[PDB]
Design an enzyme around this catalytic site. Structure first.
Site, PDB file in Angstrom:
ATOM      1  CG  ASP A 129      -2.057   1.270   1.057  1.00 21.35           C
ATOM      2  OD1 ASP A 129      -1.815   2.000   0.150  1.00 21.35           O
ATOM      3  OD2 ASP A 129      -2.487   1.481   2.234  1.00 21.35           O
TER       4      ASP A 129
ATOM      5  CD1 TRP B 277     -10.968  -1.512   7.412  1.00 16.69           C
ATOM      6  CD2 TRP B 277      -9.151  -0.180   7.530  1.00 16.69           C
ATOM      7  NE1 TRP B 277      -9.821  -2.180   8.072  1.00 16.69           N
ATOM      8  CE2 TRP B 277      -8.850  -1.243   7.997  1.00 16.69           C
ATOM      9  CE3 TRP B 277      -8.261   0.936   7.334  1.00 16.69           C
ATOM     10  CZ2 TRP B 277      -7.799  -1.549   8.664  1.00 16.69           C
ATOM     11  CZ3 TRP B 277      -6.930   0.703   7.961  1.00 16.69           C
ATOM     12  CH2 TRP B 277      -6.692  -0.443   8.527  1.00 16.69           C
TER      13      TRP B 277
ATOM     14  CD  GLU C 263      -1.813  -5.742   4.118  1.00 16.63           C
ATOM     15  OE1 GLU C 263      -1.249  -5.026   3.341  1.00 16.63           O
ATOM     16  OE2 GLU C 263      -3.221  -5.539   4.739  1.00 16.63           O
TER      17      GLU C 263
ATOM     18  CG  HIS D 232       4.556  -3.789   4.308  1.00 13.25           C
ATOM     19  ND1 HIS D 232       4.370  -4.249   5.675  1.00 13.25           N
ATOM     20  CD2 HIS D 232       3.378  -2.863   3.699  1.00 13.25           C
ATOM     21  CE1 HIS D 232       3.345  -3.297   5.979  1.00 13.25           C
ATOM     22  NE2 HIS D 232       2.826  -2.653   5.011  1.00 13.25           N
TER      23      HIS D 232
ATOM     24  CD  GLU E 124       1.328  -5.549   1.079  1.00 14.39           C
ATOM     25  OE1 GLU E 124       1.954  -5.201   1.611  1.00 14.39           O
ATOM     26  OE2 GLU E 124      -0.027  -5.510   1.132  1.00 14.39           O
TER      27      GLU E 124
ATOM     28  CG  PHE F 217      -7.282   5.067   2.287  1.00 17.45           C
ATOM     29  CD1 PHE F 217      -7.365   4.378   3.858  1.00 17.45           C
ATOM     30  CD2 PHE F 217      -8.322   5.512   1.934  1.00 17.45           C
ATOM     31  CE1 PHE F 217      -8.324   4.112   4.320  1.00 17.45           C
ATOM     32  CE2 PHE F 217      -9.734   5.197   2.483  1.00 17.45           C
ATOM     33  CZ  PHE F 217      -9.786   4.629   3.784  1.00 17.45           C
TER      34      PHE F 217
HETATM   35 MG    MG Z   1      -1.699  -4.344   1.566  1.00 18.71          MG
HETATM   36 NA    NA Z   2      -2.338   3.536   3.449  1.00 13.00          NA
END
Ligand code: MG
Ligand code: NA
Ligand code: MG
Ligand code: MG
Ligand code: MG
Ligand code: NA
Ligand code: NA
Ligand code: NA
Lengths: 1014, 1014
Positions: free
Chosen positions: A200, A991, A460, A390, A415, A600
């Site tokens: 992300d 969220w 994730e 990550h 990920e 986000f």
């Molecule tokens: Mg993710």
């Molecule tokens: Na984010």
């Protein structure tokens, strides 16, 4: 040559084949510099054998690798610009960076990527000295290339690499020539590796980390591992250094491992090559293990980052140095014992934060200065741990964390969040090789760093057998560090630590197959014995971190709740430029990127320029290493340090009456780790005047540290002491349109058709641009919005419930407006009903008592329908005509604080410029609230009572209808929101609804009183 | 095309890169046939969608892949021969097969292989029907190609493959054309994969397993797993069938899984695609799991191989069948509980053997007939388990083992024995991908076979982290089977079973870092709880399997000693042809292969033609499923079957006096699994004549089985019953040269210069070609030689100790030779000393008493020096002038038996042709001994006493000095060796002394008596 040509190299499409993650790439290894002098190595002086190719490269962009002309392999293109390397080419305007969170930026069809695959063709003409090519090995090191790349040297194909976040090294010895050489690097934005890089974050590309040349001898150190073993009390240590060589073995070769504390040699060891027998065929002839004894080692910790220097000399028996490598060594033991993560025998409490490598101007290019800035800010806000979210970070990072004292979770660049199911690839053996390279090569690079205390298998990517395999691989090769992995429910067989994401303290979230239990409950599930450290919690998206104190209360109460990593450190905003050249902060969708996850990307405690958000202070307070308990006039100070005595701390205390100091003092802190110190306060004053006494204590660090200046405040607390409770008539003129009350030079005008105080005069100057009206709404926070979007409504989001209930569209209906003259005051009584589509949501019943002193006492009683969503606020708002430079208030401050985020705020007399009462969240929302306010002074106005307030140049409407902060325009005058009550902001996640019941305005009946005067 | 050309394809040298194990290879999966009819699938009828390309291919051999001409890609070479595929091209004479055991057949420099890399260019022109190319997918399946290969179709490059022992599949749909097509397969003998294929076997190459075309629909079954779950008593089972699809998903698609017992449908299940939710992103839309209930399932075991038929139908909702796959399903549970390996709740006792895929004529090409022959022989000799040493076998194998009832250990094709250290590659993450493919693709292929009860990670590759990782991978993907691995000491973290190689019963072998404890001791080591099953034991090299009974006594006494796998089933000899066209058996070095491990390729219980060695019978007896105990006249029969009642067994018993039957009978066996049956014998005879009564019991299977004919003997035992002890004068003529004794037509002549009986006459016919002399030596067994070679002596080998001590060169010295006439006999007394380099090794003192009945009674008293190696034998030998057709003896037989291998032999009157008294071990040695012999009849000669003997046409000298059996020539007359004492043969291993102390001739003084008469 035919086989060096693009046509041939590109034909196999190695970037669409997970069976080919590299070609001709050298083995991973710890940082090397190939010092030919042992003192240089000891002193970490720059090696002449390690040369930087960072600087001006030639760059050409193409929409697909097919479009690259063969001539590029031999001569620079005419269309080629000069660019700085390292760089992301989206930051140079060649194509757009894409912010997407879960959804892959490409069509999901692994291992294939779009035919339109943006391609960056880098080239560098450089000079190589004759000595480098006369003897030895010359390799090129690419510390990071996103996403994949082919490498040519002087027109000849060298190799291929994937895994954007680890170094790729290639031997150029057979390709270089004395004098002028040309590197040609074709970087592809998309590859099969991109399916394992769905973090992300902004999706960018290029040669975004350092490029170097390293010259080593033919007979060289190829790898070396350091391990530290201890006795039961850490009084004796054994440093075990395993050294491996490549090249020609010879009986005169020797390895010397020396250990230094500054300029003092504390241990040394010499030995010929040849390890012990390990199986039936013998041992490693090309390896040797030195075992050095260190008595009373100075242990490494985030509190005291004691480091030694290990120098590994490959030399001859007669003393000639062939080469030297070196590392910083930290003596510490990390182990999980009886359900607790222990460092040097003590249970850790992780004051952690997730940190992406992000810079608003250079994207994902990291520099030392920004790293240091981040580390300093983190330590100054009582963080002791960082999670490499990550992916493996720039090498220097770890060194700095070794030096400054941060615990690091080193995370493999895996990920697959966008897959359906999430483990589609990680459960597939055909992707086990690729994944393995991302794990193994991380460990091989970073295993000597003491700061790295935990390995992570990625993020994730569900739970598949590949995770179990690689978990066990790590455990076999490096049993000195726990392995964690959150995927597949946060408690799988592939993790030593229960490491959930956004698990709440007390509330269960029973999702199918991957529930997020309450962390307290999670610890006690049948058969569960592991420690619990949240890999992500306290989602700091905008105005957030509501409920953070609940987490830290739990962490301190429960032994096996050993903390977590806040999400996250820094907003991933990027700088764009207006037509007038002004820079503004941009988020998803502002680069034409589509689809995108709009704001986000901004979940940080600090802005992208490393300016703090208000929430950071909350974190600092909850994570502080000194806890305080008040008993009478005795302060019990408890240390949460595990290793260091409070040798640089003094406690300042101050007693104040309604903001006026009455007494103070300083007491040196002398408290052992995990110890207690009782501090008796001298008899505090007994002020016979009215008001609340407040005791405030602050721990100050008198002396500077590597990470903090002199006078740094590291902890604080405030308590209420004793309280002593406090023990011309306006002329009314009634018209059909308004009640007018006059007293001296003050005039109040109430509109009888609206029922609101519509104007106020001091002399002849109007004071209101907008009437004083009830407000039950706020410009929604990101936590209020959640994932709801105008196209895809999320019905359970607070903003959607409010909108559906008509809170923003509710029409005030006058029920009552009456005036009456008392003996010494005028009383205006009003009653309003807010209605939507026939339903009455709110009823407000007010009394305005204007007395002979000019003071207008406002009493407000609100009824809220039980079946309408609980309102964000219950208060008043008006647009004041005046604009004053400063705001003074007796209340909680100085920073923005909300009912579920105000523990860090202190009650005092605060005085700030008006600008500091607005928090410039990039996505505008309700902001700047100060709670627990008993007095507010703005211009000639004074409001008194017990209220929350914000004061700004921006209406709630404007904040709500503006997407970016740079698009806000100060309105005429000043908007004042005075709330009797205000809803929590949430933040457990952004969220789903996250405001805990105790911070929702659910009482149905509310009462508050104000006094407005000059 | 340029990129399809050899020049380009070969440039990357993918066969010298462990990062490239394949290119464009399809996913592994269980056996597929793509039936378009569900009844065909149920009945395992041959699918028209599965076509065999086995047959006549064109083949050309080249010394290196560079030497292949580009024209080969388009048209067959002129120099190309027609060969049968599958085949190994060393069996066709193109180059030599190499027998090497540990040492790699190539220079050890991974991942590189020699530039001279023998290359086999196969090609096939075939026809493809239009329907196959109109719609759907056409793949080519190579079930085995050694070692690596590139694949072209119609001149276009398709792909690349490694792992010689698993199928490699490629999609040809985009390459085929209606009508005539040409495959071109370039097979390389050496690749990087060869570093993982260092098994102790012949090194050959080629397309040695089947080649097939498979046509599937676009929407197809891509994988399917069967699992069986049970309740506590196996009365209820759930078959869980997970089915995966590829292609276009559509809501009308359905999967039906039906389970059949012969013609009876026992369960069925239908469902649309879409599995349950497994993580936050959902579930597998392209998978479905059917859960079928089966009440009172018939459980699978080696004893009762009950099989069901699972048919997996991919069809439409309206009933149209798209395709059908199928498997044999065996309901069984394999699990380790409390230290014991349990099958269907009962502890297994593994009567196992290691089996290589070897054929003397076709090399490593396996056919159904040979597999069936092997399985039948194994089951007929009381084997219930086979270890796939050391690679996945031909698919059919597993099916046959499912059908006939053998437990299978399926072993990944990973052996790095030649590396130094052995784990150099397996501890290297750069080789983790390659290794992974060899493990994962094995599991994916073979996981539905019930016969496979244990996975093995390979063989003799040390212990590295890659093993731990892949162990955990297997455990995650298939927890239904234990995983074992012997490397790194046989008890590492990468094995659920302690699985040592050649660990001895009572003797420890404390090797550094990988000791081989006594198995009894191994079980009890602190912290050790696992079961112990020897992956290799009882090395059957030549005349071996001495001490086998000790293993089986231990297995039966110790619960956690659950057996082992004998090494090994079949000699890996190859057929060569003499100048006269006669075939002979050849071993290492007979093909010019150098270096080579000469005869260590022949370790089998059966010859390469599947003719049994004598040792096999020993195994059969020790592994028999009925144990017997005698108490008076009561036989206790105990069943070692776990599941089956003795429903096809009768016990025949017979009492005999010195070989003459006196009574017999039959009793039906009715004994439950693990039960006891008492069988009272009727009052046996009380023969007042002299001699030993012997009771012999045999279990006979009256009815035929799938693996045995009617009357099969499956078990036997013998006990001694009551014993009743037995309660003309030759003329001497003395000369200076000899004593001559005459009695009737018999004459004995003793030489006075030698001291030996030098001649015997019956009438005028001489009976001796060579005097009757003491013998203390034997033609050394392979166990006597060990690894000792004329160039590299092994001083601890028995043969080397014997040679160094002078046993073979010892010169007999006459001490005494005297004659004396008694009242009714003549007495010749002799004394000899055997000496070497001044030391007296042996002294023999004999008396020959020739009496008035013609009987010559020989008394022999031997002294053996305590400090000389214990002699192989203490006996006499002579060359008899006569050659008779048959040998009759009262003793142990009928087969060859030695003191540490004679449990299976029975005492009786045996009568065999002389040829059957010679065991034709390919490497000649001492052979044919029969022990416990009380009477021997050969021609007119009778010897009586208590002795061991062998009788043949070959001297011990000839056996010792001849390398191959085909080079032996029958000498004049017959060599008779009569031993009072004979040393054990050993066999725990064949590279170290293995003869246990109790079978060594260490007493220092020995006595034996013979009677020689007509
Ligand atoms: Mg993710
Ligand atoms: Na984010
Ligand atoms: Mg690739
Ligand atoms: Mg390869
Ligand atoms: Mg081997
Ligand atoms: Na805790
Ligand atoms: Na046992
Ligand atoms: Na062998």
């Amino acid at each position: 040559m035919i086989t060096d040509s693009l046509a041939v190299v590109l034909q196999r499409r190695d970037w669409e084949n997970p069976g080919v993650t590299q070609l001709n790439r050298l083995a991973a290894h710890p940082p090397f510099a190939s010092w030919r002098n042992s003192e240089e190595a000891r002193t970490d002086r720059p090696s002449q054998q390690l040369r930087s190719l960072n600087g001006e490269w030639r760059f050409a962009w193409f929409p697909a690798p097919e479009a690259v002309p063969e001539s590029w392999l031999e001569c620079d293109l005419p269309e080629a610009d000069t660019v700085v390397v390292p760089s992301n080419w989206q930051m140079h305007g060649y194509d757009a960076p894409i912010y997407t969170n879960v959804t892959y930026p490409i069509t999901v069809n692994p291992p294939f990527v779009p035919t339109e695959n943006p391609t960056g063709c880098y080239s560098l003409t450089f000079n190589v000295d004759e000595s480098w090519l006369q003897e030895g090995q010359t390799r090129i090191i690419f510390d990071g290339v996103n996403s994949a790349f082919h490498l040519w040297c002087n027109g000849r194909w060298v190799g291929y690499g994937q895994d954007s976040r680890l170094p790729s090294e290639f031997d150029l010895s057979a390709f270089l020539r004395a004098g002028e050489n040309r590197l040609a690097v074709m970087v592809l934005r998309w590859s099969d590796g991109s399916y394992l890089e769905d973090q992300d974050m902004w999706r960018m590309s290029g040669i975004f980390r350092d490029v170097s040349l390293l010259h080593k001898p033919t007979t060289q150190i190829s790898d070396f591992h350091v391990a530290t073993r201890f006795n039961d009390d850490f009084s004796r240590a054994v440093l075990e250094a395993e050294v491996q060589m490549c090249g020609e073995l010879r009986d005169y070769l020797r390895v010397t491992v020396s250990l230094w504390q500054g300029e003092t040699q504390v241990a040394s060891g010499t030995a010929p090559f040849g390890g012990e027998i390990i199986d039936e065929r013998g041992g490693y002839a090309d390896r040797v293990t030195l075992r050095l004894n260190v008595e009373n080692p100075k242990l490494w910790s985030a509190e005291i980052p004691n480091l030694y220097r290990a120098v590994v000399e490959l030399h001859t028996a007669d003393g000639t140095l062939i080469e030297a490598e070196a590392c910083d060594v930290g003596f510490r033991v990390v182990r999980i014992e009886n359900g607790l993560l222990l460092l040097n025998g003590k249970p850790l409490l992780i004051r952690g934060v997730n940190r992406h490598e992000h810079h608003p101007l250079h994207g994902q290019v990291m520099d030392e200065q920004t790293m240091v800035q981040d580390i300093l800010l983190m330590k100054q806000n009582n963080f002791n741990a960082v999670r490499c979210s990550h992916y493996p970070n720039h090498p220097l990072w770890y060194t700095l964390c070794d030096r400054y004292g941060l615990y690091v979770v080193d995370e493999a660049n895996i990920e697959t969040h966008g897959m359906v199911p999430m483990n589609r690839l990680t459960d597939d053996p055909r992707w086990l090789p690729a994944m393995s390279e991302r794990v193994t090569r991380m460990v091989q690079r970073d295993r000597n760093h003491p700061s790295v205390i935990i390995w992570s298998l990625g993020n994730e990517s569900g739970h598949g057998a590949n995770h179990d395999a690689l978990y066990r691989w790590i455990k076999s090769v490096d049993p000195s560090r726990p392995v964690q992995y959150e995927g597949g429910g946060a408690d799988t067989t592939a993790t030593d630590i229960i490491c959930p994401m956004y698990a709440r303290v007390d509330e269960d979230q029973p999702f199918p197959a991957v529930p997020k239990w309450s962390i307290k409950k999670w610890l006690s599930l049948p058969g569960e014995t592991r420690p619990l450290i949240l890999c992500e919690y306290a989602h700091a998206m905008g105005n957030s971190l509501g409920g953070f104190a609940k987490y830290w209360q739990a962490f301190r109460q429960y032994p096996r709740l050993q903390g977590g990593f806040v999400w996250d450190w820094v907003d991933q905003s990027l700088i764009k430029y207006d037509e007038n050249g002004n820079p503004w902060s941009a988020y998803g969708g502002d680069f034409g990127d589509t689809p995108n996850d709009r704001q986000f990307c901004m979940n940080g405690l600090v802005f992208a320029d490393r300016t703090p958000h208000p929430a950071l202070t909350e974190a600092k307070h909850q994570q502080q290493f000194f806890q305080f308990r008040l008993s009478g006039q005795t302060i019990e100070v408890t240390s949460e340090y595990l290793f260091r005595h409070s040798d640089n701390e003094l406690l300042h205390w101050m007693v104040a009456l309604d903001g006026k100091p009455l007494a103070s003092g300083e007491v040196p802190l002398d408290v052992a780790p995990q110890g207690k110190q009782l501090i008796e306060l001298p008899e505090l004053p007994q002020p016979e005047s009215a008001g609340q006494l407040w005791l405030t204590v602050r721990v100050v660090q008198p002396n500077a540290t590597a990470w903090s200046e002199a006078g740094h405040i590291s902890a604080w607390q405030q308590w209420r002491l004793a309280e002593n409770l406090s023990v011309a008539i306006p002329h009314l003129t009634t018209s059909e349109m308004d009640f007018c009350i006059e007293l001296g030079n003050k005039r109040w005008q109430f509109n009888r058709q609206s029922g609101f105080l519509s104007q106020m005069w001091i002399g002849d100057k109007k004071q209101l641009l907008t009437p004083l009206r009830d407000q039950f709404t706020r410009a929604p926070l990101d936590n209020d919005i959640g994932v709801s979007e105008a196209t895809r409504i999320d019905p359970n989001a607070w903003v959607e419930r409010w909108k559906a209930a008509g809170h923003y569209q509710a029409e005030a209906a006058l029920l009552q407006c009456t005036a009456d003259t008392l003996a010494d005051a005028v009383l205006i009584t009003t009653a309003h009903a807010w209605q939507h589509q026939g339903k009455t949501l709110f009823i407000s019943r007010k009394t305005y008592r204007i007395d002979g002193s000019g003071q207008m006492a406002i009493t407000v009683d609100v009824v809220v329908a039980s079946d309408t969503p609980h309102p964000a606020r219950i208060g008043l708002n008006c647009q004041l005509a005046q604009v004053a430079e400063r705001v003074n208030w007796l209340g909680l401050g100085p920073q923005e604080n909300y009912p579920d985020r105000l523990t860090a705020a202190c009650f005092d007399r605060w005085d700030l410029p008006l600008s500091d009462m607005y928090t410039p969240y990039v996505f505008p929302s309700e902001n700047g609230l100060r709670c627990g306010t008993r007095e507010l002074n703005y211009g000639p106005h004074q409001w008194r009572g017990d209220f929350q307030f914000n004061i700004s140049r921006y209406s709630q409407q404007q904040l709500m209808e503006t997407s970016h902060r740079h698009l806000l325009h100060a309105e005429e005058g000043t908007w004042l929101n005075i709330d009797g009550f205000h809803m929590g902001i949430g933040g457990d996640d952004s969220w789903s609804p996250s405001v805990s019941a105790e911070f929702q305005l659910s009482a149905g009946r509310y009462h508050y009183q104000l006094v407005w005067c000059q």
